[PDB]
Ligand binder design. Structure first.
Ligand SMILES: CCc1noc(C(=O)NCc2ccc(F)cc2)n1
Length: 149
């Protein structure tokens, strides 16, 4: 699959992260990201996608070695970590046809896994509106502990 790039934007307290909500197949909450174009550098893709989806330009703040990358079903998604963005920043997507809403969420309150259905003796996982974000949450908490404390 084509690699995706984007960002994990945190506020100044390091408490909260910025998620975006799309439509239809993308109707839940996730980190702003999208597919790399032909010949496009990872940092330029990240900034382009984040600006398209949030109206915030991360180009001046990207750090080359500060990211979390996960391979999910043989597709690579890399989110650059961008701390210290004020909570009163005005975010507006390019594209209300693509982005329903943009909100800060408390990291400590976000799930880092979906819930099973063991009370119902049924296999699988319960739906969760943070499905796309969930894989990055434990790695982000661990990354923050190693960098900041
Ligand atoms: C496949 C199930 C699913 N549900 O929500 C998503 C998802 O990606 N949402 C975040 C997002 C990211 C970028 C974007 F442009 C719009 C929305 N996927």
């Amino acid at each position: 699959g084509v690699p995706t790039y984007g960002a994990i934007i945190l506020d100044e307290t390091l408490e909260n992260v910025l998620l975006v909500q799309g439509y239809l197949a993308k109707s839940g909450w996730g980190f702003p990201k999208g597919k790399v174009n032909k010949e496009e550098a990872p940092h330029d893709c990240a900034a382009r996608e984040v600006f398209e989806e949030t109206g915030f330009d991360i180009k001046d703040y990207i750090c080359k070695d500060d990211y979390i990358e996960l391979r999910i079903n043989d597709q690579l998604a890399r989110l650059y970590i961008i701390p210290g963005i004020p909570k009163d920043t005005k975010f507006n997507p390019k594209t209300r046809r693509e982005i329903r809403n943009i909100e800060w969420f408390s990291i400590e309150k976000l799930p880092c896994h979906r819930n099973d259905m063991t009370p119902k003796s049924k296999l699988g996982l319960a739906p969760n509106k943070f499905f796309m974000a969930i894989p990055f949450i434990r790695p982000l908490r661990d990354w923050l502990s190693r960098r900041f404390g």
